[PDB]
Design a protein around this ligand. Structure first.
Ligand SMILES: Nc1ncnc2c1ncn2[C@@H]1O[C@H](CSCC[C@H](N)C(=O)O)[C@@H](O)[C@H]1O
Ligand SMILES: [Zn+2]
Length: 264
């Protein structure tokens, strides 16, 4: 029932595992066990044997192991509303970062039928294209079905955005999100990062992470504000990846360009 427990268990934190024990206690009327009977994250939980479960909880371990196997076999539903919002959070993060890092003068938003910019504050010429534009936004959307075989020498200025616009093959100058390899040969996988240029504020478990690209992490002392925002962003990102989306980017994408935005 708890939101994190709808992620695949490989994404569960140590705290998530504890909430899982409490949920299972109530759902199955099990003997209450101490909250750190399984003091590990989900990745670790998945490495335990059924015998390890029984030793760890003589009264409920076998049940807990079998519950985990059922969760692994029939993954949780997942809420479309929350997953949508998570995907939009990531879209804004990634496209904002790309525009700041590489200063593209034009963005070709291919498969956007509503003519909405995911980074409306960016200094860039935003152009929209779609095979079936919404009739109430078609006046500013180019009606176009993208195929690499037909369009690979077009849209060569700036960057192209294909946010869940599944085409035969993406051009080299692209930012892509795709739901579940030859389509991606011109691109590389985009690893997780968090970038923020919002002001630091100090008033948490300290956040240690090389992927928190903030002014306060230049010296490894992330402020409370960016610690909180990083963890919220990571939760959204996990929701997206656990649901089956994958991110791809032009091969020159470099997070050091983001560190450099801090003058440093
Ligand atoms: N080959 C193609 N060329 C242009 N648009 C395409 C396309 N294949 C699918 N589409 C369009 O891509 C959209 C996918 S759904 C909307 C995706 C949008 N980028 C978003 O993030 O909300 C639809 O509007 C559909 O008409
Ligand atoms: Zn900060």
């Amino acid at each position: 029932l708890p939101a994190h427990l709808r992620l695949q268990p490989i994404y569960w934190s140590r705290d998530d595992v504890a909430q899982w024990l409490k949920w299972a206690e109530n759902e199955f009327s099990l003997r209450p066990i101490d909250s750190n009977t399984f003091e590990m994250n989900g990745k670790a939980l998945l490495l335990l044997t059924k015998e390890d479960f029984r030793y760890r909880s003589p009264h409920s371990g076998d049940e807990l192991y079998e519950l985990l196997q059922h969760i692994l076999a029939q993954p949780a539903a997942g809420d479309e509303l929350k997953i949508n919002a998570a995907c939009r959070k990531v879209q804004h993060m990634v496209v904002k970062a790309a525009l700041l890092a590489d200063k593209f003068p034009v963005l070709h938003d291919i498969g956007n039928p509503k003519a909405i910019k995911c980074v409306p504050q960016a200094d860039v010429e935003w152009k929209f294209y779609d095979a079936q534009p919404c009739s109430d936004k078609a006046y500013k959307i180019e009606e176009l079905f993208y195929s690499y075989a037909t369009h690979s020498d077009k849209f060569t200025d700036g960057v192209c955005l294909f946010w869940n616009c599944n085409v035969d093959r993406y051009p080299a100058n692209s930012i892509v999100c795709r739901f579940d390899k030859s389509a991606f040969v011109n691109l590389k996988q985009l690893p997780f990062f968090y970038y923020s240029d919002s002001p630091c504020e100090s008033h948490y478990v300290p956040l240690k992470s090389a992927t928190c690209i903030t002014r306060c992490n230049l010296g490894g002392a992330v402020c409370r504000h960016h610690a909180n925002e990083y963890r919220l962003y990571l939760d959204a990102y996990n929701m997206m990846i656990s649901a089956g989306f994958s991110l791809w980017v032009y091969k020159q994408f470099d997070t050091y360009n983001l560190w450099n935005t801090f003058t440093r």
